[PDB]
Amino acid sequence: FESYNPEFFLYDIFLKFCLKYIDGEICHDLFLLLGKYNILPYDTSNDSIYACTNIKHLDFINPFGVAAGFDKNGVCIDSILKLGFSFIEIGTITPRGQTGNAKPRIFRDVESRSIINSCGFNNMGCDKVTENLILFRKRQEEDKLLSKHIVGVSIGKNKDTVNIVDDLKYCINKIGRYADYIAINVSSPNTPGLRDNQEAGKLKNIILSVKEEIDNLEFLWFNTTKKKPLVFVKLAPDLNQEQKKEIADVLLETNIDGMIISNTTTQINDIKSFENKKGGVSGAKLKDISTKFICEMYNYTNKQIPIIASGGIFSGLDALEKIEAGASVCQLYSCLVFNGMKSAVQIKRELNHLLYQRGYYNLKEAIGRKH
Ligand SMILES: Cc1cc2nc3c(=O)[nH]c(=O)nc-3n(C[C@H](O)[C@H](O)[C@H](O)COP(=O)(O)O)c2cc1C
């Protein structure tokens, strides 16, 4: 075993320990601290050119990135990317820093590889996170192994903010220049009233405001693409067909660059250890629900809006199911929690194998093949 490799057995011993004894958020923060101090293992393999993917000019070296919320403040972007991910969606930052809901607010259920959280948009604020992203961009600029890595920024509203657009615009003005794309978060179930912004009418206004604000912002782009950040919207899977269809029409009207399918769900209640817990559920129990959601939106949007998959992706098989359902790229969170540091290297290898086995010459060919 190569001790610098994410697959080094020692990291699995650590993973077992963490999962067995350590509080969810404490472990998470410890992990981010390890990454901040750059003492995490890293992937040294070269990514298959056959598994590269894209969403317009956004070129991902591999189809795996880490979902929003994992590095809410962008404290160790480099370290996380070097685990083998092609991109990371930092934050889900708010104009002002806020503490989030009362702890403990993150619980694991290993048997079902599920997580439930009621974090509440805890983050250091757009100002501080921008500084962290700026530091990364400068670092990315001197390093070359990160030149093609992508960083997206998830944005939301502060707990008391009346008009979400006011917060979105503030964040864009501050960090938009350093983002490869912006993720409009209107699907968190831990911020009262936030999900109402998924109503076709409101969502349309929000998306246009975000796009205009990005244009109004426009060496210029200190990001990877060297172009203005694309716009994605992250949706909750707890919507009825009518709602999804109306949203689908808005996404086409607003010509949104992409849609991150499925944030956590609130319709799961078959998990024993989560009965007395609040928040959104992530993990295996969310996979089918979110995959189906992808199928629907892919159809409802006539395969015109690129999809970033999120929800219960742990293996290459799970990723292929998301891909064949219409997803062009995948985001992981729970996988990192349950499979640990070897998450990226492992899932990439699995997907390459599976793509080969099934007879695909590349990953793109598989996108939507479940038609
Ligand atoms: C502790 C925790 C915090 C999260 N924070 C955010 C966030 O700030 N913004 C966001 O868009 N999603 C957030 N998510 C949702 C994940 O990005 C992802 O959509 C969801 O967990 C489904 O992926 P998974 O099944 O692979 O875990 C969070 C999830 C967890 C478990």
Ligand SMILES: CCCCCCCCOCCOCCOCCOCCOCCO
């Ligand atoms: C200090 C050494 C402790 C060793 C414990 C050995 C347990 C044997 O499991 C072997 C396979 O582990 C592979 C890595 O898995 C990491 C994630 O483990 C999930 C929980 O596993 C529970 C059983 O250990």
Ligand SMILES: CCCCCCCCOCCOCCOCCOCCOCCO
């Ligand atoms: C099912 C019961 C499992 C019990 C497991 C006991 C595990 C104790 O874990 C200690 C080993 O983890 C090593 C730490 O690696 C993570 C960070 O690496 C940074 C470098 O650290 C070197 C000093 O450890």
Ligand SMILES: C/C(O)=C(\C#N)C(=O)Nc1ccc(C(F)(F)F)cc1
């Ligand atoms: C609930 C929870 O456990 C988390 C969250 N969020 C989390 O990041 N955990 C977590 C993060 C990293 C590891 C490892 F180091 F092993 F790779 C293990 C667990």
Ligand SMILES: O=C(O)c1cc(=O)[nH]c(=O)[nH]1
């Ligand atoms: O910060 C949070 O509570 C949060 C945000 C989000 O988008 N999803 C989630 O499950 N939690």
